[PDB]
Ligand binder design. Sequence first.
Ligand SMILES: *[C@@H]1O[C@H](CO)[C@@H](O)[C@H](O)[C@H]1NC(C)=O
Lengths: 53, 53, 367, 342
Amino acid sequence: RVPKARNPTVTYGKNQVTMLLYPDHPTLLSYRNMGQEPNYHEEWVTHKKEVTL
Amino acid sequence: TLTVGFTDSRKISHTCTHPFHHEPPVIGRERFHSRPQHGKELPCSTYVQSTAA
Amino acid sequence: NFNVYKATRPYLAHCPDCGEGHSCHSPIALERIRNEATDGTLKIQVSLQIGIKTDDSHDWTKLRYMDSHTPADAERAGLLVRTSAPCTITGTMGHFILARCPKGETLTVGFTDSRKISHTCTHPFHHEPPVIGRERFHSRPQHGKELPCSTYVQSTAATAEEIEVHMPPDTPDRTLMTQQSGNVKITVNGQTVRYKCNCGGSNEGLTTTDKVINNCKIDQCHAAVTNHKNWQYNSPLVPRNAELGDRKGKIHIPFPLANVTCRVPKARNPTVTYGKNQVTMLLYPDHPTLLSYRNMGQEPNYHEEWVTHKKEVTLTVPTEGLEVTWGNNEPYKYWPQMSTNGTAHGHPHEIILYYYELYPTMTVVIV
Amino acid sequence: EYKTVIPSPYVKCCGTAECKDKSLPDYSCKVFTGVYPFMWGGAYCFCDAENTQLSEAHVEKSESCKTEFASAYRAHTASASAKLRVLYQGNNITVAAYANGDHAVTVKDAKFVVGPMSSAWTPFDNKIVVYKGDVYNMDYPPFGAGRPGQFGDIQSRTPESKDVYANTQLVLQRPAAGTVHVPYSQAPSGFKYWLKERGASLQHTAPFGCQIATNPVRAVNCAVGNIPISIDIPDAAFTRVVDAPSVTDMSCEVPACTHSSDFGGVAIIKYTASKKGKCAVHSMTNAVTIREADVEVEGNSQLQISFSTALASAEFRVQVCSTQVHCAAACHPPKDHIVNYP
Ligand SMILES: *[C@@H]1O[C@H](CO)[C@@H](O)[C@H](O)[C@H]1NC(C)=O
């Protein structure tokens, strides 16, 4: 077994998303584009980071 | 480090130790340290109690 | 003598961890952790009772536990809790224990049975005492300042903090059954048991006497003893009785909250060296501590850093003064005095130094 | 901080449950099907997949609120009170009064009026949030619109009021197969968290360093503006000029002086007077100050006075017994560049 993660709280903006994340323990967050270009990113999180995409 | 110890019929404590860095591998992105009541299930290698190799 | 738990009973619930990775059912299931106290002491709710016997005494020697749908008494001494190292128990009453435990991330409890068995459970609960004051201290001092902080108390009489207790639904166990040449035999041994089988004939029935249903497989169906004598206090794990939400029977939670003073260490007084309108403070942390400085004028010039090693820091005083706060010690104020003796009035002018050291950049561009 | 109440889940076999709305804060419910829970003695019930599970939960205030909490106020204006020490008839006397130009205080037959404060500036702000002993300038969200994971996530009118407001996205989940339990997606408490990222208190961020206290909340010892003081002094303290001894043959000298934050200047004056008696001393130039207020004069004698200046060369008059004496000297810079006392 492996735990899930606290579902983040997402706020809004013009073509922009502001996801606030509660780790509750060291956890990984990654994002990537849906097109031919990845725009890969992957960070480690241990505190509540409010991130914008 | 890693030490072992035992008590003799001599009523003596015999102990030995070796420096061995024991780091459980983080399985999945969520670096979890105690498995949950609720969560996903993933494969992972492990041992068994069988006594016939 | 704070005796309200006559009809209570312990659980035997699915603990998340019975040890060695697999999760099983234990009598020491825990489902509530309270850590709002600033001091760091924690309430721990626990499934089984403590401080009582089957006869409803109040000696702390024993505690009550469920097993085989029957109560039993076991020594209180063997109870223990851990996060990273053995912790310290202070509260022992009903279903709540007051414990203080050093910095730890998980939290397990364990006890020894009259079965001479060790039953243990654990939950991952990140326990981080809040740093009170700037000086991040880990063991309170012989000498130091005193600050308020929330904490608990040993009182055993609460004020309107009620928890409901309801009649246990049932415990469906098939050990009572046994196959007698295709004839299932159900044994009651002195309880109220509802049997219900898909088999025809007496498919359903509540009885208190040993019964037999012939010409039917034991795996055909299940039966459950319907206990409704001593009430069981509500928990998410336990299933509901399936009639409604609440049931009569309420108990108060002891160990209330109050805030009291607690000690906090001072900080090594730094050694200060000197310079032209400049101060060089060398700091000995002795542990993680905060150092901040701010101007005395309408502009703050705020700064606040964390320090854990000896940093030698330099500050440039403004004409209006500067105050620095170090740890929880009283802040030190430094404001400039005239700069230098280098300037002097005499046959060689030496006034440019006067008007530079005092009012630099002013009365000099005037020249 | 809030407490999440989740009573024992409703289990059922061969039948289905139903959600009935509850008029409770953030109350939530859900149902699931096909769950086959197992207990210690075996399966709870036989219906392999016809069984159902109903769960529900809500959130309430914690009894700890009665002791620990954070309170948001909308303080806007303020009033000023102050303490003064006055040297009257050769003794220090303490006075206390509202520094707003209204309060008048009588002491030792004299009427003192203080204020109003020249500057209306304050270190506070229209909206403030207070912990047990700390104050913060911070714009809290409007009541009833708390953002989860942030300050104000739970709103209560008073520590004792039963009514509350909450916003915690309490969503349930399907229970783990083979087990009886209730999962909850309880929102993490933003209140406890805000205590973790409080930041610097206003006692450090306040310009002019106005020390801040509580119960009641006050801002103290900040230097801004000036104060007007009106003193009505009965004539009893006043002494007719004839009463005061005369003064003559006034000479001044400065063996040495040192412009500094302290009374680094020393001046010796030779004086001759009619008779023994007290006499006030003053400097009529603001560039220099004198520590002493008055002095006894016997006649053809001398005296010493300690004063502070800032001019490189100190050239000033001094008034005593309604007479003026010149004083000229050349001070020198001290060695220290910075001092602690103000
Ligand atoms: C008034 O205060 C000063 C401050 O140090 C003190 O020296 C003096 O003795 C006090 N009393 C007087 C001046 O009568």
